[PDB]
């Protein structure tokens, strides 16, 4: 009885953790776009908080278990949350890194608008959001359509990857920037794989 309160905020902690990750990406992409160290500097010192939300939720879970010991579909949610919460941390971590490489791309002009990375990022934020609200609220049709999304991201990557190899196949100087940029794109694909893990874990835990 005393335990529902505990669990219901814990779920909202995860939801909050996810808005912060989404906003990291959002900042990270912007800082990369309108080239802006002062913004990536925000992203980087931002992880601090996400690392702590991770810690917190972990620490919340262990209390819920030792205090109450759940069973059946409840212990299954806590253990599952304990799990999806480090996926969330990694995601926000990738973000940290996107910001890292944005700092380095400030070291010279744009070789390209940065088109692709955006469409990716845009989609990616949508994934984070849902992959969680699919876990927490066990909507299988949502989780399934998130899983389906990761492959539009994939396109964009193995698509950019080919445009990014124009610039080297046509100019020596270039390499330095396109280099950082590849890294940057793989980060966004990672963020999706992460989220689609969470969507799998959801589909998993769910029909239990």
> Regarding the domain with residue range 1-111, which homologous superfamily does it belong to in the CATH classification?
Phosphate transport system protein phou homolog 2; domain 2 (1.20.58.220)
Classified as helix, coil or strand, 183 is helix
CA 104 to chain centre: 21
CA distances from 117 to 10, 65, 113, 150 (A): 33, 41, 10, 14
Q: Which two tokens stand for residue 56?
A: 């917190």
Reference 44, options 99, 89, 86, 105; nearest CA is 99
**CA–CA gap between residue 172 and residue 191 (Å, rounded):** 31
Extract the tokens encoding 21: 């990750």
Residue with token string 């908080």: 49
d(CA 202, CA 184): 28
19-194-44 Cα angle (round to 5)? 55
Residue 60 contacts residue 10 (beta carbons within 8 Å): yes
Give the integer Cα–Cα distance in Å for 101 and 178.
Answer: 11
Method: X-ray
Question: Which two three-digit tokens encode residue 128?
Answer: 């984070």
Contacts with 120 (C-beta within 8 Å, 6 or more apart), sequence order: 153, 156, 157, 185, 188, 189
- Angstrom distances, CA of residue 194 to CA of 38, 84, 85, 103, 109: 28, 9, 11, 24, 31
Question: Dihedral sign, CA of 135, 139, 142, 147?
Answer: positive
Q: What is the CA radius of gyration of the chain?
A: 19
Residue pair 188/153 in contact (Cβ under 8 Å)? The answer is yes
Per-domain boundaries in the chain: 1-111, 112-208
Distances (CA, A) of 180 to 58, 117, 118, 153, 189: 34, 12, 16, 19, 15
Residues 6+ apart with CB under 8 A from 191: 25, 91, 94, 95, 124, 127, 128
CB neighbours (10 Å) of residue 97?
Answer: 18
Q: What distance in Å separates the CA atoms of residue 77 and residue 207, rounded to the nearest whole number?
A: 12
- Report the distance separating Cα 26 and Cα 102, nearest Å: 13
Q: Which of 130, 119, 114 is nearest to 18 (CA)?
A: 130
Domains 1-111 and 112-208 share a fold: yes
Residues 6+ apart with CB under 8 A from 7: 64, 74, 77, 78
Instruction: State the CATH class of domain 112-208.
Output: mainly alpha
Which residues contact residue 144 at a Cβ distance below 8 angstroms, ignoring those fewer than 6 apart?
A: 199, 203
**Cα–Cα–Cα angle for 48, 53, 56, nearest 5°?**
125
Q: What number of other Cβ atoms are within 10 A of residue 26's Cβ?
A: 17
Query: How many helices and strands (H and E) does the chain possess?
Result: 6, 0
Q: Are 207 and 141 in contact (CB under 8 A)?
A: no
């Amino acid at each position: 009885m005393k335990l529902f309160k505990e669990l219901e905020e814990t779920k909202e902690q995860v939801i909050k953790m996810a808005k912060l990750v989404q906003e990291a990406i959002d900042k990270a992409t912007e800082a990369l776009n309108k080239q802006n160290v002062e913004l990536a500097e925000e992203v980087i010192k931002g992880d601090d908080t996400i690392d702590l939300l991770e810690v917190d939720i972990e620490r919340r879970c262990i209390r819920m278990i030792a205090l109450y010991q759940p069973e059946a579909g409840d212990l299954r949610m806590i253990m599952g949350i304990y799990k999806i919460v480090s996926d969330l941390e990694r995601m926000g971590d990738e973000a940290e890194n996107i910001a890292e490489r944005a700092i380095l791309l400030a070291e010279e002009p744009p070789l390209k608008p940065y088109v692709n990375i955006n469409f990716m990022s845009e989609i990616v934020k949508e994934m984070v959001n849902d992959s969680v609200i699919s876990f927490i609220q066990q909507d299988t049709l949502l989780a399934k359509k998130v899983i389906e999304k990761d492959d539009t991201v994939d396109e964009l990557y193995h698509q950019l990857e080919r445009e990014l190899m124009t610039y080297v196949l046509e100019d020596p100087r270039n390499i330095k920037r396109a280099m950082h940029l590849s890294f940057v794109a793989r980060h966004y694909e990672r963020i999706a794989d992460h989220a689609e893990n969470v969507a799998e874990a959801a589909i998993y835990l769910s029909e239990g």
